[PDB]
Design a protein around this ligand. Structure first.
Ligand SMILES: C=CC(=O)N1CCC[C@@H](n2nc(-c3ccc(Oc4ccccc4)cc3)c3c(N)ncnc32)C1
Length: 290
């Protein structure tokens, strides 16, 4: 009724409503709140018992994954849940923004060094989901890639439980498949989506911006060469090779995450020191919101 529990930084706290400052909306119903006992600002989501049955099923399936992903550094964490007679309140790690909004703020390219660190994190998150929990994400795109002012990069909880349109990020083998009732693709389609995401964020241009309809984009995916990084922006050979491998059109030759994690681009950005935190803070201070 009056007391819940938040676990943050390996410590459990009692939390009554007086311990939390409502700081308003995030960019479903979710509030930014500051926990006065620690200074953390967290996200609190409300799932109403009377809510839409599909939206609630999605929230519960995503939460179930988040709860059992406490050992993955690259997935947003849950700090607690509070159940009342009429509602469920879910306390989540609050990130600063997604990569889609970051591109919009940047009005252009995001630097390769940031994208390298992003790639490492997001591949490891997707690989973790598949290996540990059997989850094929199926919706890899910039809006699901989160960053914060601590320099962390993490996969969003939304849809983290997988399937249970984005023609833009659809792999060729997903376009006119034999049985879309039994859509039996694997993680390689998400590898393609990651590649498209990286080109979009690196160039500040979605590779199919000039298309006027969803069907048009699918024609381009099939008919055109893969939309590789351009050569006029100073991208490393490693980055260019990584994106080329992700955007292998024939899925039978497209690498899986385990192979991608061996790639020179990933090994490089594992060791390179990149101050993502300071960079992110600079962006957020020089730019406006939506
Ligand atoms: C100041 C905000 C406030 O009142 N609000 C705004 C938001 C919707 C409403 N709300 N929120 C809570 C609530 C419940 C829990 C929690 O933190 C947890 C603590 C431990 C684990 C998980 C979460 C934060 C707020 C809440 C509630 N208890 N009862 C009714 N409406 C509520 C009205």
């Amino acid at each position: 009724k009056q007391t819940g529990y938040l676990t943050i930084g390996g410590q459990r706290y009692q939390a009554e409503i007086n311990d939390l400052e409502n700081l308003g909306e995030m960019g479903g119903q979710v509030w930014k709140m500051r926990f006065r006992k620690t200074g953390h600002v967290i996200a609190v989501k409300q799932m109403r018992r009377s809510g839409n049955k599909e939206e609630n099923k999605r929230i519960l399936m995503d939460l179930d994954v988040v709860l059992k992903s406490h050992d993955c550094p690259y997935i947003v964490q849950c700090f607690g849940t509070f159940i009342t007679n009429t509602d469920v309140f879910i306390a989540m790690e609050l990130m600063g923004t997604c990569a889609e909004k970051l591109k919009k703020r940047m009005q252009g390219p995001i630097p390769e060094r940031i994208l390298g660190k992003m790639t490492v994190a997001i591949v490891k998150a997707l690989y973790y989901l598949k290996e540990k929990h059997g989850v094929i994400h199926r919706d890899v795109k910039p809006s699901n890639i989160l960053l914060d002012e601590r320099g962390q990069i993490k996969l969003c909880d939304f849809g983290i439980s997988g399937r249970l349109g984005c023609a833009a990020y659809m792999a060729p083998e997903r376009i006119d498949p034999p049985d879309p009732t039994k859509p039996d693709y694997d993680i390689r389609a998400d590898v393609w989506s990651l590649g498209i995401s990286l080109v979009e964020l690196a160039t500040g241009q979605f590779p199919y911006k000039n298309c006027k309809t969803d069907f048009e984009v699918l024609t381009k995916v099939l008919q055109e060469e893969p939309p590789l990084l351009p050569g006029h922006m100073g991208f490393s050979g490693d980055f260019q090779s990584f994106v080329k491998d992700c955007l292998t059109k024939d899925h039978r030759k497209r690498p899986k995450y385990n192979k991608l994690l061996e790639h020179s681009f990933i090994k490089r950005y594992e060791t390179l020191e990149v101050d993502v935190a300071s960079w992110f803070k600079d962006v957020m201070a020089k730019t406006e919101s939506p």
